Each structure stands twice: as structure tokens, then as C-alpha cells.
Design a protein around this ligand. Structure first.
Ligand SMILES: CN1C[C@H](C(=O)N[C@]2(C)O[C@@]3(O)[C@@H]4CCCN4C(=O)[C@H](Cc4ccccc4)N3C2=O)C=C2c3cccc4[nH]cc(c34)C[C@H]21
Ligand SMILES: CC(C)CCC[C@@H](C)[C@H]1CC[C@H]2[C@@H]3CC=C4C[C@@H](O)CC[C@]4(C)[C@H]3CC[C@]12C
Ligand SMILES: CCCCCCCC/C=C\CCCCCCCC(=O)OC[C@@H](O)CO
Ligand SMILES: CCCCCCCC/C=C\CCCCCCCC(=O)OC[C@@H](O)CO
Ligand SMILES: CCCCCCCC/C=C\CCCCCCCC(=O)OC[C@@H](O)CO
Ligand SMILES: CCCCCCCC/C=C\CCCCCCCC(=O)OC[C@H](O)CO
Ligand SMILES: CCCCCCCC/C=C\CCCCCCCC(=O)O
Ligand SMILES: CCCCCCCC/C=C\CCCCCCCC(=O)O
Ligand SMILES: *C(=O)CCCCCCCCCCCCCCC
Length: 375
């Protein structure tokens, strides 16, 4: 039997996988480099991810077409065979752990809204980036250390089940199933943190509005004195420079209205509280817009990161199946793995572009670069 010719697959993968990978990732790299409105610590996570995915498109994917266009034999020098396999595992592991790091960072941005400093966040982002790259080297390093065996002076550039079986098993657990478990946990932690944030907002909004109704109905000075002291210790619950002054206005306004209540002026205190209703609306509507934006961004990150992990699932499941199952047809599972490697390349390839397309400023940058603007 003869398989035939598979050049049509090679041409299809250049147009629909390699070109979009190199194209989409350079656009993300250009946006973070040229647009000053995007030069923030959180986007350096995206740039590193885009660099890793761009390096797959230029150095891993074109070398991966050779097995499709030619035979099983390696045409390039012997030294470049473990080097290509190493870069393949390195850059593909980096793209999975970057999303894991972006997810944990985004959860921290919700759980810890304050304590954010521009200079300190840059250092913190670079530290987390470095850790992700060191994690990726550690998972990819067993390939060149173990090496690939050759009488013939030519080798077949593929990891065998006899030599790399355990690497394929524990490498998959470390590169995919460990960041997947972390991302599942952070998903439910983010769902809990966003509900708690909303529940505390209503808790303070109700306490503010209910004590204000006591003042508008008050007849004596004692009714105002007690209802205003409750708002004094509850004003710091919604706030904690912008938050330090945010509470300071209302805390000062309550103290000024309590001064009138101490004096005995009931009408003057009631007037100060009704003029305070326009001040509480300005902070409630602002904090209500912040939670809606956090929830919208988390829903976007969720679907995009889930579709990424879903496209890597066929490769890592079949991988473990070929290793653990001995009764399974090895020929059919190898044929499926060849397709699943390419579905994974698509997944990492278009991953940063798809995500950044939901940010209007990033989407506006891409629209300028496709017509070669660069401002
Ligand atoms: C996409 N990339 C592909 C790359 C790879 O398989 N490259 C070869 C060259 O292609 C195969 O898939 C081919 C396709 C046809 C049959 N093949 C095999 O049988 C064996 C896999 C295998 C070996 C032993 C036992 C079971 C399966 N292949 C190979 O060695 C390694 C990866 C990887 C392995 C382990 C951890 C990882 N993290 C990230 C990654 C990764 C990135 C990830
Ligand atoms: C046949 C294969 C090997 C070559 C494929 C050519 C690739 C590298 C080409 C084809 C179209 C190209 C893109 C066309 C448009 C732009 C907009 C420009 O502002 C920045 C670069 C960018 C994003 C290009 C980068 C390189 C690109 C992806
Ligand atoms: C990072 C750079 C990767 C360098 C990794 C070193 C592996 C090596 O050269 O040893 C090979 C032996 O197994 C002999 O065949
Ligand atoms: C082979 C295909 C080549 C793709 C390259 C085409 C993209 C255009 C570009 O990067 O040039 C603009 C800058 O030079 C700024 O002036
Ligand atoms: C991979 C190949 C993609 C090439 C992309 C090259 C982009 C260079 C550019 O446009 O930047 C210049 C600006 O500073 C001009 O003001
Ligand atoms: C296989 C999925 C199993 C269970 C569903 C749980 C949902 C898992 C979806 C992961 C998406 C994730 O990464 O989200 C993180 C969160 O949004 C950070 O801000
Ligand atoms: C830094 C953290 C790096 C963590 C490294 C984790 C896993 C690497 C996988 C090791 C598998 C080696 C198996 C070799 C074998 O086949 O005997
Ligand atoms: C998707 C059906 C193609 C499978 C036909 C079998 C031929 C095997 C030869 C090369 C495998 C490359 C095909 C992988 C393309 C899928 C990637 C994608 O989703 O864009
Ligand atoms: C600036 O105005 C943007 C650049 C415009 C696009 C240039 C087109 C380059 C063509 C190269 C594609 C080669 C691969 C073909 C597919 C098989």
C-alpha cells in the first residue's frame, strides 16, 4: 500500500495557521510597543505571551511541515533535531502558563482593588513573567538531556513511547493539567469575589439610605445624633488617594452635619443630609460601574481562555491514551496526534489576538497597523 501525496495539507496549514499566528501576534506586540495608552504592567503579560506564540509560528510550525511534505526522516543537521523538540515544548508550555498567570493576576485585581502602585506593579509583572518562563524551561529540559537515538547516520525526529513515555505522561500533567486545575479554582474564586463585592455594595447602600430616611422623618435632635453615628463607621466599608479622599468627603460631611445636631439645629442638619444625597449618588454609581466592568472582563477572559484549553484537550488526552493504553491501535492514535498537534498550534497561535480584540483601544491599534499607520 501507498499513502500518496500530502502537499495540500502543508499549503492549508501555512494560510490558516502559520500566517494568522505570525500576523496576529506581531499586531499585539506592536500595540503594546507603540501605543502609550497600553504601556501598563498587566499588558506586559500579553506581550510575553505574544512573543512566545510568535516564536512558535517562526521557528516551530515551519519545521513541523517537513514531516507532512517529506518522509519520517530528518533532512536538517542532527543537532537541530533535539533543539526543535525543546523549543516546541518550551513555547507551547509558556502559552498555557501565561494564561494561568493572567487569570491569577486578574483575580488579585478584583480581590485586592487597592494596594496598586505603577512602579511596584511593573516589577511584580516582570517577576511573574520570569517564573512562567523558568517553569517552561524545567518542563522542556528532559528532551535535550535525554536526547533522541539515531548503523544509519540519519534519525527520525520524534519522541518514542519506550524512551519518552514517562516524560509524555508527567510532562502533560505539569504543562496542561496543573495550570488547568489552578484556572478552575480561580474561576470559582472570581465568581465568589464578584458576588461578595456586589453584596457589600448593597449592604452599605441600604445602611446609607435607611439612616437618611430617619433624618427626613426626625422631629428631635437625638433621632439625628444616633442615625448619623452609624454612617460614620460604615463609610470606610465601601472605600477601603482616590479612596482616601472618597470617604474623607462623606466622613467630613457627616461630622459637619453632626456639629449642627450637637448645636440643636434640627432643620440645618436635615438640610445638610439632603444635600449629601447628590454626593452618595456620585460614589455609588461610580462603584457600580467598576463592578460591571470587572464582571464583563471576567466573562470575556473566561470564554476565551476556556476555548484555548478546549483546543489543547485532544492533544494531551490522546497523548496519555497512547502511553497508558497498550491494547489501543498505536497507528490510528499517532494519525490523530498529528492533527491534534496542529489544533493546539491554532489554539496558542490566535489566542492573544482573540482576547485583545475585546479591548477597544487594542482593536483600534490593530485597525491602524493593517493600513500601516503607526501614528
Ligand atoms: C505540540 N507539541 C508537540 C510535541 C510532539 O509531540 N512532537 C512529536 C514530534 O509529534 C508527535 O506528537 C507525533 C505526531 C504523530 C505521532 N507522534 C508521536 O507519537 C509523538 C508524541 C508521543 C511520544 C511518546 C509517547 C506518546 C506520544 N510526537 C512527537 O514526539 C510535544 C509536545 C509536548 C509534550 C509534553 C509536554 C508538553 N508541553 C507542551 C507541549 C508538550 C507541546 C507539544
Ligand atoms: C509563506 C510564508 C512562509 C510567509 C508568510 C508571510 C507572513 C510572515 C506575512 C504575510 C502577511 C503579513 C502581515 C501583513 C500585515 C501586517 C500589518 C503591519 O502593520 C505589521 C505586520 C503584519 C502583521 C504582517 C506580518 C507578516 C505577515 C503575517
Ligand atoms: C537551554 C539549552 C539546552 C541544553 C541542554 C543540554 C543537553 C545536552 O547537551 O546533553 C546531551 C546528552 O544527552 C548527550 O547526547
Ligand atoms: C514575506 C512577507 C513580508 C511581510 C511584511 C509586511 C508588513 C509591513 C511592514 O512591517 O513594514 C512597515 C515598516 O517598515 C514601517 O515603515
Ligand atoms: C514578523 C514581521 C513583521 C514586521 C513588523 C515591523 C514593524 C515596524 C514598524 O512599523 O514600526 C515603526 C514605527 O515606529 C514607525 O513610526
Ligand atoms: C474542564 C472544565 C471543568 C469544569 C468547569 C469550570 C470552569 C473552568 C473555566 C476556566 C476559565 C478561567 O481561566 O477563568 C479564570 C477567571 O476568569 C480569572 O479571572
Ligand atoms: C521549575 C519547575 C519545573 C518542574 C518540572 C516538572 C516536570 C518535568 C517532567 C519530568 C519528566 C521526566 C521523565 C523522564 C523519563 O522518561 O524517565
Ligand atoms: C482535519 C482533517 C485532515 C486530516 C487528514 C489526514 C492527513 C494527515 C496529514 C496531515 C495532518 C495535518 C492536518 C491537520 C489540520 C487540522 C488543523 C486545523 O484545525 O486547522
Ligand atoms: C501595511 O499597509 C500592511 C501590509 C499589507 C499586506 C501585505 C501582503 C503581503 C503578502 C505576503 C503573503 C504570502 C503568503 C501567501 C499565502 C500562500
Amino acid at each position: 500500500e501507498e499513502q500518496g501525496n500530502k502537499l495540500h495539507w502543508a499549503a492549508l496549514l501555512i494560510l490558516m495557521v502559520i500566517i494568522p499566528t505570525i500576523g496576529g501576534n506581531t499586531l499585539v506586540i506592536l500595540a503594546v510597543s507603540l501605543e502609550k495608552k497600553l504601556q501598563y504592567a498587566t499588558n506586559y503579560f500579553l506581550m510575553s505571551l505574544a512573543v512566545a506564540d510568535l516564536l512558535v509560528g517562526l521557528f516551530v510550525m515551519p519545521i513541523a511541515l517537513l514531516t507532512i511534505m517529506f518522509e519520517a526522516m530528518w533532512p536538517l543537521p542532527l543537532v537541530l533535531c533535539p533543539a526543535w523538540l525543546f523549543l516546541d515544548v518550551l513555547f507551547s508550555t509558556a502559552s498555557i502558563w501565561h494564561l494561568c498567570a493572567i487569570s491569577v493576576d486578574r483575580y488579585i485585581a478584583i480581590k485586592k482593588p487597592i494596594q496598586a502602585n505603577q512602579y511596584n506593579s511593573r516589577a511584580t509583572a516582570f517577576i511573574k513573567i520570569t517564573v512562567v518562563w523558568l517553569i517552561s524551561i524545567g518542563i522542556a529540559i528532559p528532551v535535550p538531556i535525554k536526547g533522541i537515538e539515531t548503523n544509519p547516520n540519519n534519525i527520525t525526529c520524534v519522541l518514542t513511547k519506550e524512551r519518552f513515555g514517562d516524560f509524555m505522561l508527567f510532562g502533560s500533567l505539569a504543562a496542561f493539567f496543573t495550570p488547568l486545575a489552578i484556572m478552575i479554582v480561580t474561576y470559582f474564586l472570581t465568581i465568589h469575589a464578584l458576588q461578595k463585592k456586589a453584596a457589600d455594595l448593597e449592604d452599605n447602600w441600604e445602611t446609607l439610605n435607611d439612616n437618611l430616611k430617619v433624618i427626613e422623618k426626625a422631629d428631635n435632635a437625638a433621632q439625628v445624633k444616633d442615625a448619623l453615628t452609624k454612617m460614620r463607621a460604615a463609610a470606610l466599608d465601601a472605600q477601603k488617594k482616590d479612596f482616601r479622599h472618597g470617604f474623607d468627603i462623606l466622613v467630613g460631611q457627616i461630622d459637619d452635619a453632626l456639629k449642627l445636631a450637637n448645636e440643636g439645629k434640627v432643620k440645618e442638619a436635615q438640610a445638610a443630609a439632603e444635600q449629601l444625597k447628590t454626593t452618595r449618588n456620585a460614589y455609588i454609581q461610580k462603584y457600580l460601574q467598576t463592578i460591571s466592568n470587572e464582571q464583563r472582563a471576567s466573562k470575556v477572559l473566561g470564554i476565551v481562555f476556556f476555548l484555548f484549553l478546549l483546543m489543547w484537550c485532544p492533544f494531551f488526552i490522546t497523548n496519555i491514551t497512547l502511553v497508558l493504553c497498550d491494547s489501543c491501535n498505536q497507528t490510528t492514535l499517532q494519525m490523530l496526534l498529528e492533527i491534534f498537534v496542529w489544533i493546539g498550534y491554532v489554539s496558542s497561535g490566535v489566542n492573544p489576538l482573540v482576547y485583545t480584540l475585546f479591548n477597544k483601544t487594542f482593536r483600534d491599534a490593530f485597525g491602524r497597523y493593517i493600513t500601516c499607520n503607526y501614528r
